[PDB]
Amino acid sequence: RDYEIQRERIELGRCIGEGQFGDVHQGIYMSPENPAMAVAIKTCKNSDSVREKFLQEALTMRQFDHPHIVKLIGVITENPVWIIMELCTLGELRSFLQVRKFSLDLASLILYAYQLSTALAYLESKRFVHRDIAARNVLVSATDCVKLGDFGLSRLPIKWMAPESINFRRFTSASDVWMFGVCMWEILMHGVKPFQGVKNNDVIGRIENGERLPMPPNCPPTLYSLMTKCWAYDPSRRPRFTELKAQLSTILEEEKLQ
């Protein structure tokens, strides 16, 4: 139906980040049914050239409907242009993992990997290639719930990219699977970035030498083995996301009954 929201139904609040287009705020949305709802508000500092690209990102999220992908709520298309998104109260995943490193049990880390794999198996089933899977693009809705962030605000990430993406600019769901392996490593490392202190240009040579990100401390070997399957050099030998989801379900259940 209609995605336009009357500005008077939005109470703007504090800033919580930025983007290619401007600051992101949190706020409150009063609709006739379910008021009042907590939301994120994307703002655009500048034009009509930028207005074009800004609102196309909202269009992009319109096609998706998954419990572990942030929802588009609506848009305000008169200046100042706003995009209204579902709020993930607890913010960016990397910061959350760093702050709560010694307060999070392993079962929660595995839960986050599983939840993200369900979102990515959904995108794979829609034949949608993401190209920017990384912990920096995950949001924390609750201590038991993470979500892929807005795809526009997700937008080279060499240290996450599959070799065929680095070498030949090939992007498929199988190259997404490689990136997801790196994302899983980031989670089990409590938000450390991959290949710290390594130059981007040196990454592909290490991959082609057979080198891989090592097993994170306290990571179950079955889960690290799953990561290494995402990093098969030949993309046809990587699991599909629906297989990763099935394997993550059993790893999760063995760690803690759901």
Ligand X SMILES: CCC(=O)NCCNc1c(NCc2ccc(Nc3ncc(Cl)c(Nc4ccccc4C(=O)NC)n3)cc2)c(=O)c1=O
247 annotated as a binding-site residue: no
User: Do the bridges between strand 10-17 and strand 37-43 make them parallel or antiparallel, or are there none, so unpaired?
Assistant: unpaired
230 annotated as a binding-site residue: no
- Binding residues for ligand X, rule: CB under 6 A, are 14, 16-17, 24, 26, 40, 70, 85-88, 90-92, 95-96, 137, 139, 149-150, 153-154
Minimum CB separation of residue 142 from ligand X in Å reads 12
15 annotated as a binding-site residue: no
Beta bridge partners of 17: 24
Q: Which is nearer to ligand X, 99 or 232 (CB)?
A: 99
- CA triplet 93, 131, 243: central angle to 5 degrees? 80
Catalytic, 132? Answer: yes
> Please, which residues have CB within 8 angstroms of residue 190's CB and are 6 or more apart in sequence?
97, 98, 101, 104
88 annotated as a binding-site residue: yes
Minimum CB separation of residue 220 from ligand X in Å reads 27
Minimum CB separation of residue 133 from ligand X in Å reads 11
Nearest to 73 by CA among 166, 173, 175, 4: 4
Q: Which is nearer to ligand X, 77 or 95 (CB)?
A: 95
Minimum CB separation of residue 179 from ligand X in Å reads 14
Q: Which is nearer to ligand X, 96 or 160 (CB)?
A: 96
Catalytic residue selected from 23, 48, 65, 132: 132
DSSP letters of 179-218?
HHHHHHHHHHTTSPPTTTT--HHHHHHHHHTT--PPPPTT
Q: Which is nearer to ligand X, 95 or 242 (CB)?
A: 95
> Are 13 and 28 within 8 A, CB to CB?
yes
**Amino acid type, 171:** F
Q: Which is nearer to ligand X, 138 or 226 (CB)?
A: 138
Q: Which helix (H) or strand (E) holds 41?
A: strand 37-43
152 annotated as a binding-site residue: no
> Are 42 and 12 within 8 A, CB to CB?
no
Minimum CB separation of residue 169 from ligand X in Å reads 23
The alpha-carbon radius of gyration of the chain (Å, integer) is: 19
219 annotated as a binding-site residue: no
- Report the binding-site residues for ATP: 16-22, 42, 86-88
- Report the binding-site residues: 16-22, 42, 86-88
Active site residues: 132
